[PDB]
């Protein structure tokens, strides 16, 4: 995408989302990141939406194939093919974050957003990991989420949607990856309760955003308890 203008890549990412062409969307946003400039709030969301949808489809396919495999070499070979593709996309996202989105992100909102992404893509790698580096992958996810949590608690109100989504995802990490269901439940409960107590400060539109994510926390708590 080196020959396309940054603004054109952003415009085409928005069109790709409208057309539900998420692989294209991700390629346009990778090109935009590689222009070397920082991303605005809206642009960060385009980047996340694109890759979350691409990897989300790969994860769903990997889960279908892994179930069939658990129940000739073809099933294993094809699960491995999908797994390698998934790992490649995660590595690409992590590479964008490391070169050089995180290091240039100084504001709490941007830095937390990117560290949350870093935790998420290591978590997706951990979902399929089985080898000698699996513990290190889990710890890489944990470390990214923890740094994001530390910044968010110092710099953002408890209703901030990025802070809430980070806590939501880190709680999923604890439950599904780290074998720490009590930590997952504790984090979700404390996050929900501290957000509830801060809703009185919010406008109608901010209230809607914060309560939407609070409901996602509650949905998980209902499933886990």
């Amino acid at each position: 995408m080196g020959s396309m203008e940054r603004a054109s890549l952003i415009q085409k990412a928005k069109l790709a989302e409208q057309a539900e062409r998420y692989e294209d969307m991700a390629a346009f946003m990778k090109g935009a990141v590689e222009k070397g400039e920082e991303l605005s709030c809206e642009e960060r969301n385009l980047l996340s939406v694109a890759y979350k949808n691409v990897v989300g489809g790969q994860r769903a396919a990997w889960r279908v194939l892994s179930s069939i495999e658990q129940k000739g070499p073809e099933v294993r070979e094809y699960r491995e093919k999908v797994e390698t593709e998934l790992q490649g996309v995660c590595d690409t996202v992590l590479g964008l974050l490391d070169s050089h989105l995180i290091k240039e992100a100084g504001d709490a909102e941007s830095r937390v957003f990117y560290l949350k992404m870093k935790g998420d893509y290591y978590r997706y790698l951990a979902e399929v990991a089985t080898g000698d580096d699996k513990k290190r992958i889990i710890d890489s996810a944990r470390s990214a989420y923890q740094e994001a949590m530390d910044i968010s608690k110092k710099e953002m109100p408890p209703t901030n949607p990025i802070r809430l989504g980070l806590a939501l995802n880190f709680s999923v990490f604890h439950y599904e990856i780290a074998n720490s269901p009590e930590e997952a439940i504790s984090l979700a409960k404390t996050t929900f309760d501290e957000a509830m107590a801060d809703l009185h400060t919010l406008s109608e539109d901010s209230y809607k955003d914060s309560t939407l994510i609070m409901q996602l926390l509650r949905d998980n708590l209902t499933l886990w308890t």
Binding site: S48, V49, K52, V172, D209
Partner: peptide
């Protein structure tokens, strides 16, 4: 369990 969606929808 659910993680954060890409968009509010």
């Amino acid at each position: 369990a659910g993680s954060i969606p890409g968009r509010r929808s």
